[PDB]
Amino acid sequence: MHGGATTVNISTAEWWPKALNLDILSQHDRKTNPMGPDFNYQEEVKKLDVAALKQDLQALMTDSQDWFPADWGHYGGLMIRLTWHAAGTYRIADGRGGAGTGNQRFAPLNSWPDNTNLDKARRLLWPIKQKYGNKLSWADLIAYAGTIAYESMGLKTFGFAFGREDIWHPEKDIYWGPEKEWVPPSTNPNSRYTGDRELENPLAAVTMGLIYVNPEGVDGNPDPLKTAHDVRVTFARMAMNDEETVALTAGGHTVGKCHGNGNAALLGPEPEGADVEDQGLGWINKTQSGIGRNAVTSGLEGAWTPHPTQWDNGYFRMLLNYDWELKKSPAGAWQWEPINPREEDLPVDVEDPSIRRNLVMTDADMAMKMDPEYRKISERFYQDPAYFADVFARAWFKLTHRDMGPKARYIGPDVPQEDLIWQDPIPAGNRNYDVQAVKDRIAASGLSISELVSTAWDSARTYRNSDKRGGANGARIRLAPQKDWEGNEPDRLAKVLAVLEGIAAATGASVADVIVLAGNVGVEQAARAAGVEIVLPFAPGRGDATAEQTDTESFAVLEPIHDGYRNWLKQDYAATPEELLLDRTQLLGLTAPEMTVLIGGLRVLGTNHGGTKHGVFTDREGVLTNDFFVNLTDMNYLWKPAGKNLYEICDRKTNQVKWTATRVDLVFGSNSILRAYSELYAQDDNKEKFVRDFVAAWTKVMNADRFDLD
Amino acid sequence: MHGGATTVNISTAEWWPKALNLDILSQHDRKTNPMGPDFNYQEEVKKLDVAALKQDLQALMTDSQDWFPADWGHYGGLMIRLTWHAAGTYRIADGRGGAGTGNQRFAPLNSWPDNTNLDKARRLLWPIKQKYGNKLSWADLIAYAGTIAYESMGLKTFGFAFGREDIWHPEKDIYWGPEKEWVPPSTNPNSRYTGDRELENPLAAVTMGLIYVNPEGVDGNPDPLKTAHDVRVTFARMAMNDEETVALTAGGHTVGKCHGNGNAALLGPEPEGADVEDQGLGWINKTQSGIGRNAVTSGLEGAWTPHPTQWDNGYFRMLLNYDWELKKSPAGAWQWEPINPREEDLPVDVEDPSIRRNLVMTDADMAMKMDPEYRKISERFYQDPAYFADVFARAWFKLTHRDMGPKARYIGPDVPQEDLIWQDPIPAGNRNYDVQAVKDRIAASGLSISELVSTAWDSARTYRNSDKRGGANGARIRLAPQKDWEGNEPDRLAKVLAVLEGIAAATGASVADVIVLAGNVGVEQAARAAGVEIVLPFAPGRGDATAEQTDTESFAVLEPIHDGYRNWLKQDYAATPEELLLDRTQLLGLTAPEMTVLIGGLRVLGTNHGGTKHGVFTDREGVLTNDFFVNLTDMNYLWKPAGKNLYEICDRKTNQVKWTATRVDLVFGSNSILRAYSELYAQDDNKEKFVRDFVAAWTKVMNADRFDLD
C-alpha cells in the first residue's frame, strides 16, 4: 500500500481524453535508450560477419527445439510468417507500421491475435541475436529471417539490406484504429468502415488486430469475391498492386501451413497479458498439448501445398486444378478443402511423415481463383513460374524494405544495384562550388525573405520519419505532382524556381542545394534585421531527381493538405488543426520545444500560405523576433472565436481587433505544456535563445533526409 | 483524416491496463526540456536580484488587473491560497506532491476543483516571471508569492529559500487516488476509505480533487466534530501536528475570503477542458459576471475577518466570541454565519467599501472551536497572539519547504540559519584523508563482498527524489530507528558497523564515507574476481548526523518494508512486487535500464535479504557477471509457479529444479520492454558494458543525496 502511479491506467488521460498527445514527440529519448550516446548502429552492422550469420540462420531453420518444435523439422514456414507479419503492418498514407523498427517485439503488435505464436518465432531467433550482439539489430534479424527461410527452401531471393535501428518501447505515435476490442465485426460501434463499406482512410487492415484481411471471409462469412475486394483495398494501402498481391499470396502459401488442431479456448492470454511464468511468451496451452500437430494458431488447419517445406509450383496446381468447398477446421474455422484429392497430394503430418493430413485454402486464396483479375494473373503464374518467382522475389523485397528510405541507408553485401523506383532515388550532387557565391547570388536576386523561406520549408516538409520518404533532397518540389500542389502555392513556387534554377545552372550546385541555401539566406537576413549575425550551418551534396525516377502516384500520399507551420488547411477535416499539426511534427521527427520555436519564427517571417495575417503578432514582419510569444502571452488581449479555425485578438481596453489567429496559433497559449514553452520564449532574457533555437530547428528539418552524409 | 495517435486516449494502456508503467522512469528527459544541456538553475538563481523581486512582487499585490480584479485592491488573500494549495499537495508517506516542482501549472493539478481560479493567480504572476526570466523558476515564484503576500499584509514571515527547478510536464508518477470522478462522496465505488472510515494509506486528501478536507463537512454534511477528525488525519499525513494545524488554519483565514456569489453551473470547463479561446484559463463565466463580487470559486461566500486585507487577531475574535449557525451561500453551499454580528465587524464589499457583506466560517473553522484539543490551542492563540504569529510563520515556512530537502539546496538571502529538524540536517564531513588507506583497511577486514554491498545499499536506498529525504549522507543507518529496521538486517548491520566505525575513528573519515567506500570495495573486489580492474569514482564529504537531529518518528515513512533490489518483502501487500519495485526505483531517480543492471548485479553479488538464493542465477556468487541475464533469458529452462512470489526454474530435459526466483526476478524476463534490456545484457558481446553500466548505476545511487557538492 503505496503512492506510485505504478500501472498504466493511472494517468491524466482519463480526465481529459481529448487532450493533445504531446508524448509522441518525446519517444525514444536518452533514458529509455540503454546504449551509450556514441553508439552508432550503422558503423557496427558494417563490421558484421554476414556470411557467418547466413550460415547460422539457415541451420536454425532445421534446428527444431522441443518447447515449440518445427513443422516437419523446418521452421521456414513460421519464419516467413514472422517477417511477412512484421512488414505487413506498413500503410502508405503516413508510412507508419513496417518492419523497419523491429516493433513486433513490444506491445501492442506482439499480442495482436494475427501474431499468435510469432512470439515463438522471435524467441527462436534469440540465440543468433545473442551471438552477433550489437552488430545485429532485432529489427534486421526479424526482417532477414524469412528471406533466409526462402533461400533455404529453394527461392532465389532478390536481396537484402541491413540498417534498421532497434527501438526500446512501442511506437506510441501509431494510431491502429478506433476499436476497443479485438477483431470485432465491422457492424459494431467504433467501426472503421463508413459509407458503402469504405475503409477509414489511414487504416490498412479490416479490423483491429489483423494484418490485412479476415481469412474466414468478410466478418467471418466466406465469400471469395467479397474477400477479393478487401485484399485489393488493403494491399493497395500497403503499396502493392494486383500483380504483386497475387504473387505475395501464392508465394507465401507455397510453403508452410495453417494450425488449428485443438480448442482455441484452451489457449492462455496473449503475451502482454500472460503471467511472468510464461517467459514473455503467450497463447500457451497448459490444459493440453499446444505444440507440434496440436498447435492452434489461426485455427484453420491444413497446408496449401503437398510439399510445404519447399518452393515448388504446388500452390496453383492445387488451387486451379482441384475444385474446393467449405468445411470446418477442428477448432471451428471456415476453410476450403479440395474435393477428391489424391493421396500423393496430401501434406503429411508435422511429427510423423507416415500420416497424411489435409489441404486447405483460405477465403483469400479462393479469391485468387474467383476474382476475375486475380484469376488471369494466377493463370499467368501457373503457366510461367519463372515469372512468378521473379515477380514474387521482387515484391518480397519491396515488402520488407518499403519503409527503409533512400538507398544511402542500405548496408550489406546483398543489396541490389538496381535503383527501384519505390526507393525514391536521388543522385549524389556536386559538393565543390563556392557556397558564399550562391548566397550572394540568392541575396542579389529580387526575392523576399518570405519567398525564400516558404519555398525551402515546402521542399523539406514532405519528410516523414515513418518510412523515410520526402524531404528537400532530390528537389522533387520542382517536379510533378509537387510543383502543382495547392499547398505549395505553384505561382510563387514557379516564380522562385525560375530564379533558383538559374543560380544552380551558373554555379553547378543542385537546385536542391540552392533551394535550401536560399531558405538559409532569408533566415540570415531576418536575423540580421533584428541585429543578430548568424551563419546557419549548411551541408552540400543534394541531388536533383529525374521525373523518370519519380513515381507520380506514390507521392500523392505526401501532399501537404494541411500544414500548421504555414497556417495551411486545404479543407475542413474531422481532426482539429492542432492534432494535424502534431501528426506532421511527429513525422518530421520534431520535439515539442522545436515545434514551438518554428511556429513562432515562421509566423513573424510572414510565411502563411495565402499571405494571410493569422498569427503574425508583430509590427515587423520579416524580422526574426520572439514577438509571436510576447504578444500571445499578454493578457492585455482577450481572444474571441470568429468562426471556423479563426479568432480575433482584441484589446481589452478599446475592445478593438488587433490581430487574427487560428487554432494552430492559439493552442500554443492554451495547452498548459505549450504555453509553458511559449512563456519561456517570451521572457525578457530569451531573445537570443529563441533565435539560436529556431535556427537549430530549421536546420534539423533541412537536414532530416540527408542519409547520404551520416 | 490521418494516422497519428494524436489524442491521449489512443494508447496501449486500454488493452493491458494492469501493465507496469515504465514511463514514470523516463520523465523529464532531454526532449521535453527546452533548456540547454548546460543550463544550471542553481547558479542562475544565485545571481537574481531578490531585493528587486520583493519590491515587484509586493507592488503586484495591489496592482489590480481588470480581467480578474483584486478583492479590495489586495491580491494577497488569493496569492496565499495559491501557495497554500501548491504546497498542500505534499504527503509524507512517499514525499510526493509539494510546491517543490511548480506542478500546479500543468495537469491534473491546474484543473482540480479545489484549485478553482488559481489559474488566475498564476497568470497574474506572469509579468514578474517574464521580467526575471531564467533566474526565477515558476516553482520558486509560485512558492514565494504567498510569503510576500504575508509580509505585505503585516506578518513577520520566518524566511524563504529559492532552488526549485521547474519541470515541463505533469509528474506522471504521482498516484492521486482510485476515483474516476471529481469530489465524489466516500460512499461510492472506487472509494479511498476502507474499514472504520480509515483513509487509503498513501493518500492525504478526503477525496479526488481536494487538497485536504471538505469545507462543507464530511461528504458535504456539516458536523464540525467529524470534520475535526478528517483535518487531524489529513494534516498529519502532510506532517503537521495539532498545534501547527490550528495555526495554519487560523493564519490562512485571518486574511482573504470565500467566493460564491453566483451560480456555479454557469462556470465553464476547468482549464484542461476549456477551449483555446480561454487563454489556458478556466472556470470562466461567459453568461454573467464571474469577477469581483460576482466571483464563484469554492461557492461559500463571506470573509472570516472584518479586515481581510490584514494580519490582525480577527479570526479568533470572530470564531470564539460570536455564536454561529448553518446557512446557505448564494451558490448553495453550507457555511456558518455568526448570530447578531455588529455592523462594524462586517467585511465590506470587494468593489465598493460603503457596502457591508457577511462573515463566514467553514466546517473546518468550526472544528477549531468544537474539537476539544483544537479548542485549547485556539484559546492559547487567542490569549497569546505573539505565540500564534510565531507558530504560524514557522509552519508556513515548513509548509512551503517541507519537500526541498537538505539545507545545501536552499539559496538566497532570507534563509533561516536555524537547522530545523525536519530539514534532516547533516554536518559537512572531513574531506582530507587518504582514500586508498580506507580502502586497504576495509579490504584488510574480514568482511565479505556481500556484507559490504548490502550495508552500503541499505544506507542509500532510503533516498527519495520526491522530497529529497534519505540517502547515505549522514549515516542515519547507524541510528534509531534505522539500525533496528528488519529490512536492514540489524545483526549483520551491527556486525559491519562495529568494523567500519573503527576504520572511520582511525582515519577521520565519516562513518558515512566509510560505508559507501566499503560498498565500492566489495564491488571492485567482485569485478576483480571476474578479471575486470575498475576504480569506482568516489566523493568524500558526508557527515554523520546526531540522534538529536534525527526525528525518529518522521523516519518511519522511509522504512524499507519492501525492496526488490534485495528481494525483500516484509509482508504480502496488495500491490504486486514488481509495482513495488517500480515505485522505489522511481523514487531513487533511476531509469529502467539502470533498474535492470542493478538487479542483475546485486543478484550475482549475493545480496538478498536473508541470504536467500532467489534470482541468483550463477555458479559464482560474489563475482560480477552478466549471468543473471544470461540464465534468465535461456529457453533450456521453463518456469513454474511455486506459491507466493516464488517460482522454480526447471530444466526442460531433466525436469529438475535448477534455481528459484521471485516475481521481482522474473518480471525482467516477462515484460517485453524489460526482457529487451535483459536480452541486450545477455549478449556475448556485453559483459564489459554490463559492468561499466552496473557501476555507473551503483554510483548514481551512492551520490543521489550529495547536494552539498553540486
Ligand code: HEB
Ligand atoms: C509473402 C508471404 C505471405 C502473404 C502475402 C500472406 C498473406 C495472407 N495470409 Fe498467410 N502465411 C504465410 C505467408 C503469407 N501469407 C506463411 C509462410 C504461413 C505459414 C505459417 C507456418 O507455416 O507456420 C502463412 C499462414 C497463414 C495462416 C495460418 C496461420 C496459422 O498458423 O494458423 C492464415 C489464416 C493466413 C492468411 C493470409 C491471408 C488472409 C493473407 C492475405 C492474402 N496465412
Ligand code: HEB
Ligand atoms: C495557511 C493558509 C491556509 C490553510 C491551512 C487553509 C486551510 C483550509 N482552507 Fe483556506 N484559504 C486561505 C488559506 C488557508 N486555508 C486563504 C488565504 C484563502 C483566501 C482566498 C482569497 O481570499 O481569494 C482561503 C480560502 C478558502 C476557501 C474559499 C475559497 C474561495 O475563494 O471560495 C475555502 C472553502 C477554504 C477551506 C479551507 C479548509 C477546509 C482548510 C483545512 C483547514 N479556504
Ligand code: NA
Ligand atoms: Na513505418
Ligand code: NA
Ligand atoms: Na510447396
Ligand code: NA
Ligand atoms: Na505426398
Ligand code: NA
Ligand atoms: Na514532493
Ligand code: NA
Ligand atoms: Na484580518
Ligand code: NA
Ligand atoms: Na468595519
